[PDB]
Coordinates of C-alpha atoms and ligand atoms in Angstrom, one line a residue:
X1 CA 25.6 -62.6 0.8
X2 CA 26.2 -60.8 4.5
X3 CA 28.3 -57.1 4.4
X4 CA 29.9 -56.4 1.5
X5 CA 28.7 -54.2 -1.3
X6 CA 25.1 -54.3 -3.6
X7 CA 26.7 -54.6 -7.4
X8 CA 25.4 -55.0 -11.3
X9 CA 25.5 -58.1 -13.1
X10 CA 27.8 -56.3 -15.6
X11 CA 30.7 -56.9 -12.9
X12 CA 29.9 -60.5 -12.7
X13 CA 28.7 -61.5 -16.3
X14 CA 29.2 -65.0 -16.0
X15 CA 26.6 -65.7 -12.6
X16 CA 23.4 -67.2 -13.3
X17 CA 20.1 -67.1 -11.5
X18 CA 18.4 -70.5 -10.7
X19 CA 15.1 -70.3 -10.6
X20 CA 11.9 -73.0 -10.1
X21 CA 8.3 -73.4 -11.0
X22 CA 5.8 -74.3 -9.1
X23 CA 2.3 -76.0 -9.8
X24 CA 0.3 -72.8 -9.6
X25 CA 2.0 -70.2 -11.4
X26 CA 5.1 -68.5 -9.1
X27 CA 8.5 -68.9 -9.8
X28 CA 10.9 -68.8 -6.8
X29 CA 14.5 -68.1 -6.6
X30 CA 16.8 -71.2 -6.1
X31 CA 20.4 -71.1 -6.3
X32 CA 23.3 -69.2 -8.5
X33 CA 25.5 -70.8 -10.6
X34 CA 28.0 -69.9 -13.0
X35 CA 28.5 -69.5 -17.4
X36 CA 31.6 -72.2 -18.1
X37 CA 30.7 -72.2 -21.8
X38 CA 28.0 -71.1 -24.4
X39 CA 25.7 -74.3 -22.8
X40 CA 26.6 -74.8 -19.6
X41 CA 26.3 -73.8 -15.8
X42 CA 27.4 -75.1 -12.8
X43 CA 26.2 -75.1 -9.4
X44 CA 25.5 -77.6 -6.4
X45 CA 24.3 -80.8 -6.3
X46 CA 22.1 -79.8 -3.0
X47 CA 20.7 -77.5 -4.8
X48 CA 18.7 -79.6 -6.5
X49 CA 18.1 -83.4 -5.1
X50 CA 15.2 -82.5 -3.3
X51 CA 13.3 -81.7 -7.1
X52 CA 15.7 -83.5 -9.6
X53 CA 12.7 -82.8 -12.5
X54 CA 14.7 -80.8 -15.4
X55 CA 11.5 -78.7 -16.5
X56 CA 10.4 -77.5 -13.0
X57 CA 14.0 -74.8 -14.0
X58 CA 14.1 -72.0 -15.6
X59 CA 17.9 -70.3 -15.8
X60 CA 18.9 -65.9 -16.3
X61 CA 21.7 -64.7 -17.6
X62 CA 22.2 -61.0 -17.5
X63 CA 20.1 -60.6 -15.0
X64 CA 21.1 -58.1 -11.7
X65 CA 17.8 -58.2 -9.9
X66 CA 16.1 -61.1 -8.0
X67 CA 11.9 -60.2 -9.2
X68 CA 12.5 -57.8 -12.1
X69 CA 14.1 -57.5 -15.8
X70 CA 16.9 -56.7 -16.8
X71 CA 18.2 -54.9 -20.5
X72 CA 20.1 -57.7 -22.3
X73 CA 18.8 -60.6 -19.8
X74 CA 18.2 -64.3 -21.6
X75 CA 15.9 -66.7 -20.3
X76 CA 16.8 -70.8 -21.0
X77 CA 16.0 -74.1 -19.5
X78 CA 17.3 -76.9 -18.8
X79 CA 18.2 -79.0 -21.3
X80 CA 20.0 -81.6 -19.1
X81 CA 19.9 -81.4 -15.7
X82 CA 23.6 -83.6 -13.6
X83 CA 23.8 -84.0 -10.5
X84 CA 27.0 -85.8 -8.6
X85 CA 26.5 -89.5 -8.0
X86 CA 28.4 -89.3 -4.7
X87 CA 26.7 -86.5 -3.3
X88 CA 25.9 -86.9 0.8
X89 CA 25.1 -84.7 3.2
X90 CA 26.5 -85.4 7.2
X91 CA 25.9 -83.3 10.3
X92 CA 27.5 -80.2 8.5
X93 CA 29.3 -81.1 6.0
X94 CA 27.8 -81.5 2.4
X95 CA 30.4 -84.2 -0.1
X96 CA 30.8 -83.6 -3.8
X97 CA 27.9 -80.5 -4.0
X98 CA 28.2 -80.0 -7.6
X99 CA 26.1 -80.1 -10.0
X100 CA 25.7 -78.9 -13.9
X101 CA 22.9 -77.5 -16.1
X102 CA 22.8 -77.6 -19.9
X103 CA 21.1 -74.8 -21.2
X104 CA 19.3 -73.7 -24.2
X105 CA 16.3 -71.2 -25.6
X106 CA 13.4 -71.3 -26.7
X107 CA 14.6 -71.3 -29.5
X108 CA 17.3 -74.2 -29.1
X109 CA 20.4 -71.7 -29.2
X110 CA 22.9 -71.4 -25.9
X111 CA 24.0 -68.4 -24.4
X112 CA 25.8 -65.1 -26.5
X113 CA 28.3 -63.6 -25.5
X114 CA 27.7 -59.8 -25.0
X115 CA 28.6 -57.2 -21.7
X116 CA 26.4 -59.2 -19.6
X117 CA 27.1 -62.2 -20.6
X118 CA 30.4 -63.6 -20.4
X119 CA 32.1 -67.6 -19.5
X120 CA 34.4 -68.1 -16.6
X121 CA 37.0 -69.8 -16.7
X122 CA 38.2 -73.0 -15.0
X123 CA 41.6 -73.6 -13.0
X124 CA 43.7 -75.9 -13.8
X125 CA 44.0 -79.5 -12.6
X126 CA 45.5 -79.0 -8.8
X127 CA 46.2 -76.0 -9.3
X128 CA 44.3 -73.5 -6.5
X129 CA 45.5 -69.8 -5.0
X130 CA 48.3 -69.2 -2.5
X131 CA 46.1 -69.2 1.1
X132 CA 45.4 -65.8 2.4
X133 CA 45.0 -64.9 -1.2
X134 CA 41.4 -62.8 -1.8
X135 CA 38.3 -64.2 -3.6
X136 CA 35.6 -62.6 -4.4
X137 CA 31.6 -64.3 -4.4
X138 CA 28.5 -63.5 -5.2
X139 CA 24.3 -64.1 -4.5
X140 CA 20.8 -63.0 -4.1
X141 CA 21.7 -64.5 -0.6
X142 CA 20.6 -63.7 2.7
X143 CA 22.4 -60.0 4.3
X144 CA 21.8 -61.6 8.0
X145 CA 21.1 -64.9 9.5
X146 CA 17.6 -63.2 10.5
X147 CA 16.4 -62.7 7.4
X148 CA 13.4 -64.6 6.1
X149 CA 13.3 -62.6 2.1
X150 CA 16.3 -62.2 -0.2
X151 CA 17.7 -59.0 -1.3
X152 CA 16.3 -57.1 -4.6
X153 CA 19.9 -56.8 -5.8
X154 CA 22.5 -59.0 -6.5
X155 CA 25.8 -58.7 -4.1
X156 CA 29.6 -59.4 -3.3
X157 CA 32.3 -58.9 -1.3
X158 CA 35.9 -60.2 -0.6
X159 CA 37.1 -63.0 1.5
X160 CA 39.9 -64.9 2.5
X161 CA 41.3 -68.6 1.4
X162 CA 42.1 -70.3 4.7
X163 CA 43.9 -73.6 4.9
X164 CA 43.2 -76.9 5.1
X165 CA 45.3 -77.3 8.4
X166 CA 43.7 -74.1 10.1
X167 CA 40.0 -75.3 8.3
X168 CA 40.5 -78.2 10.4
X169 CA 41.2 -77.1 13.8
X170 CA 38.8 -78.2 16.7
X171 CA 37.1 -74.9 17.0
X172 CA 36.7 -74.5 13.3
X173 CA 35.1 -77.8 11.7
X174 CA 37.7 -80.4 12.3
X175 CA 37.7 -83.1 10.1
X176 CA 34.3 -82.6 9.2
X177 CA 36.0 -80.9 6.2
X178 CA 38.0 -82.5 3.7
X179 CA 41.2 -82.1 1.0
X180 CA 37.7 -81.7 -2.1
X181 CA 36.8 -78.7 -0.3
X182 CA 38.1 -75.1 0.8
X183 CA 37.6 -72.7 3.4
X184 CA 37.5 -69.1 3.0
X185 CA 36.2 -66.1 5.7
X186 CA 36.5 -62.3 5.7
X187 CA 39.9 -62.2 8.5
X188 CA 37.3 -59.7 10.5
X189 CA 34.3 -62.0 10.3
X190 CA 32.7 -59.6 9.2
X191 CA 31.5 -60.4 5.8
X192 CA 30.3 -64.1 4.2
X193 CA 28.0 -66.4 2.0
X194 CA 25.2 -67.2 3.6
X195 CA 21.8 -69.0 2.8
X196 CA 20.6 -68.5 -1.0
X197 CA 24.3 -68.2 -1.6
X198 CA 24.8 -71.7 -2.6
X199 CA 25.7 -72.6 -5.9
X200 CA 27.4 -69.7 -6.4
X201 CA 31.4 -68.6 -7.8
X202 CA 34.2 -67.8 -5.8
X203 CA 35.7 -66.8 -8.4
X204 CA 39.9 -65.7 -7.9
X205 CA 42.4 -64.4 -9.3
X206 CA 45.0 -66.8 -10.8
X207 CA 48.0 -65.7 -12.0
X208 CA 46.4 -62.3 -14.1
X209 CA 43.0 -64.4 -14.5
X210 CA 39.3 -64.7 -12.9
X211 CA 38.7 -68.3 -12.1
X212 CA 36.4 -70.5 -11.2
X213 CA 37.4 -71.1 -8.2
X214 CA 35.1 -72.8 -6.0
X215 CA 31.2 -73.1 -5.3
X216 CA 29.5 -72.2 -2.3
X217 CA 28.2 -74.8 -0.7
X218 CA 27.8 -74.9 3.5
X219 CA 28.9 -73.1 6.6
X220 CA 27.5 -73.6 10.7
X221 CA 25.4 -70.1 10.6
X222 CA 26.5 -66.9 8.8
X223 CA 29.8 -64.7 9.7
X224 CA 30.1 -66.5 12.7
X225 CA 33.9 -66.5 14.4
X226 CA 35.9 -69.8 13.2
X227 CA 33.5 -70.6 11.2
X228 CA 34.5 -69.8 7.7
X229 CA 32.3 -70.5 4.7
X230 CA 33.2 -74.3 2.6
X231 CA 33.6 -74.3 -0.8
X232 CA 33.9 -77.1 -3.4
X233 CA 36.9 -77.3 -4.5
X234 CA 36.7 -77.2 -8.6
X235 CA 40.3 -78.1 -9.5
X236 CA 39.7 -81.5 -7.9
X237 CA 36.5 -82.0 -9.5
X238 CA 37.7 -81.5 -13.6
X239 CA 37.4 -84.8 -14.7
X240 CA 34.0 -85.1 -13.8
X241 CA 33.5 -82.3 -15.3
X242 CA 34.9 -82.8 -18.7
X243 CA 33.4 -86.4 -18.9
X244 CA 29.8 -85.1 -18.2
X245 CA 30.1 -81.9 -20.8
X246 CA 31.1 -83.9 -23.6
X247 CA 27.6 -85.7 -25.2
Ligands
5IN1 N1 29.7 -69.2 4.4 C1 28.7 -69.4 5.2 N2 29.1 -69.2 6.6 C2 27.6 -70.2 4.2 C3 27.6 -70.5 3.2 C4 26.7 -71.5 2.5 C5 25.4 -71.7 3.6 C6 24.3 -72.4 2.9 N3 24.4 -73.5 2.7 C7 23.3 -74.2 3.4 O1 22.3 -73.8 4.3 C8 23.6 -75.8 3.4 C9 21.8 -76.1 2.8 O2 22.1 -77.0 3.3 C10 20.5 -77.5 3.3 C11 20.2 -79.3 2.7 C12 20.5 -80.4 3.6 C13 19.7 -81.7 3.1 C14 19.9 -81.7 1.8 C15 19.8 -80.7 0.9 C16 19.8 -79.7 1.0 N4 23.1 -76.1 5.2 C17 24.4 -75.7 6.0 O3 25.5 -74.8 5.2 C18 24.2 -76.6 7.2 C19 25.4 -77.4 7.6 O4 25.4 -78.1 6.6 N5 24.4 -75.4 8.6 S1 24.1 -74.1 9.1 O5 22.2 -74.9 9.0 O6 24.6 -73.5 10.3 C20 23.3 -73.2 7.2 C21 22.3 -72.0 7.6 C22 22.9 -70.4 8.2 C23 22.0 -69.0 8.7 C24 20.2 -69.9 8.3 C25 20.2 -71.1 8.1 C26 20.6 -72.3 7.2 C27 25.6 -71.2 5.0 C28 26.9 -70.9 5.6

């Protein structure tokens, strides 16, 4: 997150931190995610496309810091890694950037709701906020494009949803952006999501209720003028989500 502010898991209880184990003994941060049900975390497919091995991942809930523990945190293995079959990446655009991680503790249990661990609500079929609405994003991503390290403490910021027409302008993204994606940015181009925030949640208050509106996917640079962040439009994936979360 460029700009914004530091926060705690208490304020983003549905946030999931995904790490990857390495041949040696070190575990590196991969992507963010959101808990949508006790046994399910939703994220982005591009985060795992190069290493589809479920055994190498670790998911944390109730975690506020990158490389240190937090009271009340819970560690989970990935029982099942589901990537989208039609995921593809073009010059800029990432299509169908969505993925599901079924989780389970060593005892074989799913998440237990606490004050630092809660699920986020999914939207209604084709029911998204009005353009111009304010939403929040969270992540352990870069604070500046020139950094090579991720901040130690979770962060968040607020951005505005941009119409598909504005985002489709020539100086923006043109036809790279489709209706299966949502653009959002700061009107002053000061704050934005960045590398490392991928898979994270784009939360909007819809009719008095926190809804998982989008997933951090791509963008040209970070907080660049006329280059909004692009998010996977969760509302247009409800069928895919339901059919894979069954059995
Ligand atoms: N709101 C934003 N401005 C914003 C939001 C989220 C992200 C995270 N996603 C990525 O970085 C994704 C990762 O895809 C890797 C990949 C490629 C191929 C297969 C798998 C994975 N890539 C992009 O977006 C590309 C276009 O496809 N543009 S960029 O190179 O300009 C991103 C960047 C900016 C500063 C420093 C390093 C990289 C970046 C920017």
